[PDB]
Amino acid sequence: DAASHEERMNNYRKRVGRLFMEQKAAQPDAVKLPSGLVFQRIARGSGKRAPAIDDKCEVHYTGRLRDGTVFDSSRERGKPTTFRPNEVIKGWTEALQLMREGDRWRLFIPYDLAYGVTGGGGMIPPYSPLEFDVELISIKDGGKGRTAEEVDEILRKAEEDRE
Numbered sequence: 410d411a412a413s414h415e416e417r418m419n420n421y422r423k424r425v426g427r428l429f430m431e432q433k434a435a436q437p438d439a440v441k442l443p444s445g446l447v448f449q450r451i452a453r454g455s456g457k458r459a460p461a462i463d464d465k466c467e468v469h470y471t472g473r474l475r476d477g478t479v480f481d482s483s484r485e486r487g488k489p490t491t492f493r494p495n496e497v498i499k500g501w502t503e504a505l506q507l508m509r510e511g512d513r514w515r516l517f518i519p520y521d522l523a524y525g526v527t528g529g530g531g532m533i534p535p536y537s538p539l540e541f542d543v544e545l546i547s548i549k550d551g552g553k554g555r556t557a558e559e560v561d562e563i564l565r566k567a568e569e570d571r572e
């Protein structure tokens with residue numbers, strides 16, 4: 410019945426999403442944080458501060474589903490896409506606060522740090538991990554969050570803690 414089929418499909422989505430996240434975490438240069446957020450660095454920026462929770466950030470991004478299909482991007486929006494960490498999904502909240510201006514990272518966000526069991530916007534199904542290419546162009550008024558030194562402490566610990 411439709412209700413048992415819904416349960417089966419959500420168990421399927423949960424299982425294959427977990428597989429995706431384990432594969433991305435296993436990449437030789439991927440870094441996994443305690444929350445389950447995984448990232449690969451693409452470029453290192455020259456900025457010296459990360460944004461605070463409420464700093465306005467201009468981000469150039471592309472979002473992909475776990476099959477690789479692009480579902481959103483700055484390019485499609487036309488105008489500059491700006492966000493505060495406290496406005497966005499938890500995986501972005503966490504990543505932005507560990508990025509400085511000019512950083513470009515590939516994020517692999519487990520479903521519980523994205524849209525969870527609900528999904529979103531009619532194109533992100535329940536239980537989806539998400540992949541993003543994120544470049545932090547600028548933080549309005551410079552950045553009031555972590556210093557580069559503090560960011561480096563956190564990210565070095567996560568590299569060193571790799572299982």
Ligand SMILES: C[C@@H](c1ccccn1)N1C[C@H](CO)[C@H]2CCC[C@@H](C1=O)N2S(=O)(=O)c1cc(Cl)cc(Cl)c1
Nearest residue numbers: 472480481492496497498501528529530531533539
């Ligand atoms: C602000 C927040 C949000 C979510 C749901 C309702 C209202 N606001 N939000 C959306 C922004 C786009 O404004 C975008 C980029 C930042 C991360 C994430 C995000 O946290 N997504 S997204 O790429 O995952 C995404 C999700 C959906 Cl539902 C649809 C699309 Cl087209 C793209």
